[PDB]
């Protein structure tokens, strides 16, 4: 048939619940394509994955592949305007994003289903002929430099690059993947390298259609999607570039049996055990790596962790295989260290090898593999509908490793149990291959070496072959036993018929003094899953810094005890998260509705009857101590968001105030607090999914009767159900709170333009304005001025009040970031008065499409309802009401809103700024307006007292 089509694969195996339709094909120029047709999709999406990563960088220009990723967005010869691509998506309810791994460079986007072609056409040009404009090159190089800059003090990246640095220096694995201003601009200017043609040469040499894979998802039929792809991608040239494989391992003999001691930025204690293994990619169907991991990294009774934790050496454990590249992989066992654990590191590793030998003594087990295979089958069958944008990216990446007919099922289903392969991998997990790394600040001043790229303080030793054979002669431990049978494996996948009196939105089926139960039977997804959400309210949770700490430790200790039990449930697709809020506790249970009532009770009555292990108590507490202290090493832009929330909230305890009162937290004071907390509660719940009305009423009534029995819980007064308000800023005012991040060498800033209380009128005023300034904010502040890699714009919502906020991380002082934003805001208003009515209407429809997008997953829908519940506005039909109002707005409705609320000389301008200074800081463009003199907040407590407190938003429904 088609000359542009090499072949068309057979039926793409999918889940029977999947109502999308799939067609796989391969183009003449070698591009593997998967077409997904979903006539319901509001946001059409597409993605392309090139099988070339940062392992293929030129030895001199580190991270050239990463740099090229950034540059493809900034223009092609067909669409020459620098921000043509980004502007188009933003004007049609779409977004875009990309990344560069060791072997892949993945690009993706979504867009309104009516404009799939218009975006795909511009997206296709990325590989045909990119401009690689030099003025854009010398600007965007700072974005890469700033992107790497925010990671220099990140303990994760410092360790990730260190592992690469302690291997064979000439193996591509030791390369610097990110790149910076030094490798891209500074050095190539010294040595005299034309960076632009180095880019152009890399594109024609590696971005061949041979190594590409395209996934397109649209409302269009499978046949029309075929025509669309062969029109825009069949022209992409083919260089027949061989797929880069790296057979020889980066970790050879001289790198083995080596001990590393590393100084971190945070106060953390970690033990990193690693083994070199062959590329187990081709054995993916038996999957021996996942098998060995599942048993090692197990957290149930008799596991490696359950012993290493019950004697207080480690709290968390992670095992399994780690992808390196085509030709080599790793097998790792990473653990958290306690204060006592750090001293007994070599005995931890002993217990590791004692467990490895236990698997060797009993050999492979088919029943273990079978229930893994079984659970994966159920997991795949009832797989939640993925969001179009993330779906096409995920598939396009694995569209290389697998046949067309297997791509959806390849990494889920397992077919033939192969114990012989399980033996092989386990055979490589022996002491003569171990690579140990200890991360603690007890090594400061005890190091020789420094990692070049990050400045990581460490040193390389040789594991005494003294110690090696003690590990080799590991005696079989008696406390190590293989997992028992999983009782939490779901059997009843029955979908209960939609009740006669069912409702489109959650309904209040129970309303007492103690409970307020919201219920809605699932009508859109029809999977055997339920979402159980509970909020327990009690004024004694956050009345002072002391009770706040104890509420945290209480829930942290409760989760710690349930961990062994609840682990088998999580594997069986049934999970829960329990955490403390500023109003009490939050309990969420998600997964298969079969054995939910089982887990829910084992949570509640365990919660009402807690029996604190004080051994654990001071370990968790000690971890909490370092947790609060480690906030000093967080990102500057995070410190900004943290301070603003502290400023604008009626009551909020600081990190310092908490760790100050943490020393006052003793065990008897804590167990005098738990019944005090559970003495009087108010429970507001949302039960959503595969449950009937009396099923939900039975679930709630069961929760109460457990608390009423084991805690003697009684109802709270309606008077005591008070929620915190937001500080009301004065007209024409400006406040500035300034601090300094001691760790990061970058600055941070958040600029909150408080507008008014939340309402249909005010919300769509703000949301539309944020929609219009959405792309230009990124284009002006980052693409052009290059203030920083992190530039964010959008609405802020807290305690029923809203406003417009800017967030920028930079190396410029925050006061300069201040001016450039204000200069940009005058640039925007002038851009509004001058844009066409059809341009303005083009923005309205975009915002409408973005907010009418239906949830794909069950929990996705539950989130919105719960969002209307905890905010206590209960506007369940919010999206329809406010979009209808949105389309009635005109240009001067927005202009008048700007001149009144946001303008530099607006009568009702409410502005507050947070200035986080860098570690070392003191004190062509449009011209910034003259700013009023800012009132500097010196004390937060006195700040709040001077200003009024906003009202609380009235509930949409009267009770």
């Amino acid at each position: 048939n088609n000359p542009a089509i090499k072949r068309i694969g057979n039926h793409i195996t999918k889940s029977p619940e999947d109502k999308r339709e799939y067609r796989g094909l391969e183009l003449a120029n070698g591009i593997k394509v998967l077409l997904i047709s979903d006539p319901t999709t509001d946001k059409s999406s597409a993605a392309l994955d090139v099988h070339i990563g940062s392992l293929s960088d030129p030895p001199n220009i580190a991270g050239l592949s990463h740099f090229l990723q950034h540059m493809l967005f900034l223009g092609t010869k067909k669409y020459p305007k620098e921000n043509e691509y980004s502007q188009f998506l933003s004007e049609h309810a779409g977004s875009s994003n990309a990344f560069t791994s060791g072997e892949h460079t993945n690009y993706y986007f979504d867009v309104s289903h009516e404009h799939l072609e218009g975006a795909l056409d511009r997206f296709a040009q990325f590989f045909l002929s990119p401009l690689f404009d030099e003025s854009a090159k010398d600007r965007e190089v700072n974005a890469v430099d700033s992107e790497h800059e925010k990671n220099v003090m990140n303990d994760a990246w410092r360790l990730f690059q260190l592992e690469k640095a302690t291997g064979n220096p000439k193996h591509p694995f030791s390369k610097f993947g990110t790149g910076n201003k030094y490798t891209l601009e500074t050095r190539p200017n010294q040595e005299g390298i034309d960076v632009r043609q180095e880019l152009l040469k890399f594109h024609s040499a590696y971005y061949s259609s041979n190594l590409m894979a395209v996934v397109v998802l649209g409302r269009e039929s499978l046949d029309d999607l075929t025509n669309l792809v062969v029109k825009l991608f069949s022209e992409v040239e083919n260089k027949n570039v061989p797929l880069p494989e790296f057979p020889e391992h980066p970790f050879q003999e001289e790198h083995l049996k080596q001990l590393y001691k590393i100084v971190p930025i945070k106060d953390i204690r970690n033990l990193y055990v690693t083994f070199p293994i062959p590329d187990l990619q081709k054995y993916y169907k038996s999957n021996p790596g996942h098998y060995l991991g599942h048993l090692i990294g197990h957290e149930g009774p008799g596991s490696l962790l359950s012993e290493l934790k019950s004697k207080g050496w480690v709290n968390t454990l992670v095992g399994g295989q780690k992808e390196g590249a085509r030709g080599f992989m790793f097998f790792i066992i990473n653990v958290d260290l306690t204060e006592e654990g750090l001293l007994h590191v070599e005995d931890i590793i002993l217990h590791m090898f004692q467990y490895i030998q236990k698997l060797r003594a009993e050999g492979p087990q088919e029943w273990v593999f079978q229930e893994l295979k079984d659970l994966n089958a159920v997991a795949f069958r009832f797989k939640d509908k993925e969001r179009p944008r993330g779906y096409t990216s995920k598939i396009a990446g694995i569209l290389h490793y697998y046949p067309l007919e297997e791509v959806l099922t390849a990494e889920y289903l397992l077919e033939e149990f192969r114990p012989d392969l399980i033996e092989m991998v386990l055979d490589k997990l022996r002491p003569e291959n171990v690579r140990v790394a200890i991360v603690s600040k007890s090594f400061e001043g005890k190091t020789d070496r420094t990692e070049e790229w990050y400045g990581t303080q460490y040193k390389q030793e040789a594991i005494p072959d003294e110690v090696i054979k003690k590990w080799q002669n590991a005696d079989l431990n008696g406390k190590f036993k293989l997992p028992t049978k999983n009782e939490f494996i779901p059997t009843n996948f029955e979908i209960l018929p939609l009740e006669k009196e069912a409702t489109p939105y959650p309904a209040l089926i129970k309303d007492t003094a103690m409970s307020k139960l919201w219920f809605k039977q699932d009508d859109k997804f029809f999977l055997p899953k339920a979402n159980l959400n509970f909020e327990f309210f009690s004024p004694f949770a956050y009345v002072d810094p002391l009770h706040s700490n104890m509420a945290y430790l209480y829930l942290e200790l409760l989760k710690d005890s349930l961990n062994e039990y609840a682990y088998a449930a999580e594997l069986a697709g049934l999970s829960y998260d329990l955490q403390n809020t500023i109003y009490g506790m939050y309990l969420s249970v998600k997964g298969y509705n079969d054995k939910q009532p089982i887990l829910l009770k084992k949570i509640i009555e365990k919660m009402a009857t807690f029996e604190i292990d004080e051994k654990r108590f001071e370990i968790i507490k000690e971890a909490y101590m370092r947790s609060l202290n480690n906030f000093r090493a967080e990102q500057p832009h995070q410190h900004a968001m943290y301070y603003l929330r502290l400023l604008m909230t009626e009551v909020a305890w600081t990190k310092d105030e908490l760790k100050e009162a943490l020393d006052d937290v003793t065990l008897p004071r804590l167990k005098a607090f738990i019944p005090q907390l559970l003495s009087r509660l108010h429970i507001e719940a949302l039960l959503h999914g595969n449950i009937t009305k009396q099923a939900a009423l039975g679930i709630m009534q069961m929760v109460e009767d457990t608390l009423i029995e084991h805690a003697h819980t009684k109802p709270l007064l309606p008077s005591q159900l008070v929620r915190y308000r937001e500080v009301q800023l004065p007209d024409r005012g400006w406040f500035v709170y300034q601090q300094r991040n001691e760790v990061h060498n970058n600055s941070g800033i958040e600029i909150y333009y408080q507008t008014d209380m939340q309402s249909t009128s005010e919300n769509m005023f703000l949301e539309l304005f944020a929609q219009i300034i959405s792309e230009p904010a990124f284009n002006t502040l980052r693409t052009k001025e290059q203030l920083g890699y992190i530039v964010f714009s959008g609405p802020r919502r807290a305690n029923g009040i809203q406003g417009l906020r800017f967030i920028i991380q930079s190396e410029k002082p925050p006061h300069y970031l201040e001016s450039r934003v204000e200069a940009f805001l005058i640039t925007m208003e002038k851009s509004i008065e001058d844009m066409t009515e059809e341009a303005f209407q083009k923005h309205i429809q975009a915002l409408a499409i973005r907010r009418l997008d239906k949830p794909k997953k069950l929990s996705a829908e539950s989130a919105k309802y719960w969002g209307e519940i905890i905010s206590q506005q209960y506007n369940f039909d919010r999206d329809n009401t406010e979009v209808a109002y949105l389309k009635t707005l005109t240009k001067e409705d927005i202009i008048k809103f700007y001149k009144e609320m946001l303008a530099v000389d607006a009568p009702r301008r409410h502005k507050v700024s947070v200035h986080v200074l860098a570690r070392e800081m003191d004190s062509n463009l449009s011209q910034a307006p003259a700013l009023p003199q800012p009132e500097v907040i010196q004390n937060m407590t006195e700040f709040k007292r001077g200003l009024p407190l906003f009202p609380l938003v009235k509930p949409h429904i009267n009770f």
Partner: antibody, heavy 129, light 102 residues
Framework: EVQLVESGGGLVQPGGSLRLSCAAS????????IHWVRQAPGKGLEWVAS????????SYADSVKGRFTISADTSKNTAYLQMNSLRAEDTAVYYC??????????????????????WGQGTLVTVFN | MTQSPSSLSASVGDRVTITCRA????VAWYQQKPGKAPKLLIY??SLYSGVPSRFSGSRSGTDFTLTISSLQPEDFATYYC??????????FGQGTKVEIKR
């Protein structure tokens, strides 16, 4: 489709040498292990040799260790059976067969009898005085 | 290793049970018509593709059994049991010839 073809079957005599070849078609010897199973006239099956081209380890039967030698040529997809010193016991029909599964770990401490899905039609060796 | 009975005779439609005996803990089964190459029947309980469901793979302790539920006229052949062991070894049985009873 998958098929195995034996060749080199002929009439030969003690002191003399003979080399049977197993042409593999439809798959690579690189992945699967290749076996040589012979059947004496009238009697049952006797496993003679086996080679794993991937992990590079061979295995012979006690009945014949010094006289036979197995080998695998990767790119021509052929496994051989060098028979250089022959008795009258060797007069039999020699089949070549592969593993049904890929990359069978030869150094396995346990034994896993996955089937041998594809056999050749075998060549006849005959040892005469 | 040792496989009994050596020969077996039953009419078509009958239930035939052949027993192999034992170290590894599994066995395979092959069917060979006189003169031509052996065909695979059962590997590991589980049977090979194309092989009729009348063939069964069972294991009771130390003995493995091949079972033909309803014997067919095309099922009259010699059946060998094959054991894979450590050191990359392969051992067959002497075989059981199933003949026609009349």
């Amino acid at each position: 489709e998958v098929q195995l073809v034996e060749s080199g079957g002929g009439l030969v005599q003690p002191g003399g040498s003979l080399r049977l070849s197993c042409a593999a078609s439809g798959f690579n010897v690189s992945s699967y292990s290749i076996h040589w199973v012979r059947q004496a006239p009238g009697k049952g099956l006797e496993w003679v040799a086996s080679i794993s081209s991937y992990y590079g380890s061979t295995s012979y039967a006690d009945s014949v260790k010094g006289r036979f030698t197995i080998s695998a040529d990767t790119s021509k997809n052929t496994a051989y059976l060098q028979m250089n010193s022959l008795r009258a016991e060797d007069t039999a029909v020699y089949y070549c067969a592969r593993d049904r599964v890929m990359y069978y770990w030869s150094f396995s401490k346990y034994g896993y009898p996955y089937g041998m899905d594809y056999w050749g039609q075998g060549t006849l060796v005959t040892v005469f005085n | 290793m040792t496989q009994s009975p050596s020969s077996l005779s039953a009419s078509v439609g009958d239930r035939v049970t052949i027993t192999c005996r034992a170290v590894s803990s599994a066995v395979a089964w092959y069917q060979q018509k006189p003169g031509k190459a052996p065909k695979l029947l059962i590997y590991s309980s589980s049977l090979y593709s194309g092989v009729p469901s009348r063939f069964s793979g069972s294991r009771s302790g130390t003995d493995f059994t091949l079972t033909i539920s309803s014997l067919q006229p095309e099922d009259f052949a010699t059946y060998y049991c094959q054991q894979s062991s450590p050191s990359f070894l392969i051992t067959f049985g002497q075989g059981t010839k199933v003949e026609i009873k009349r």
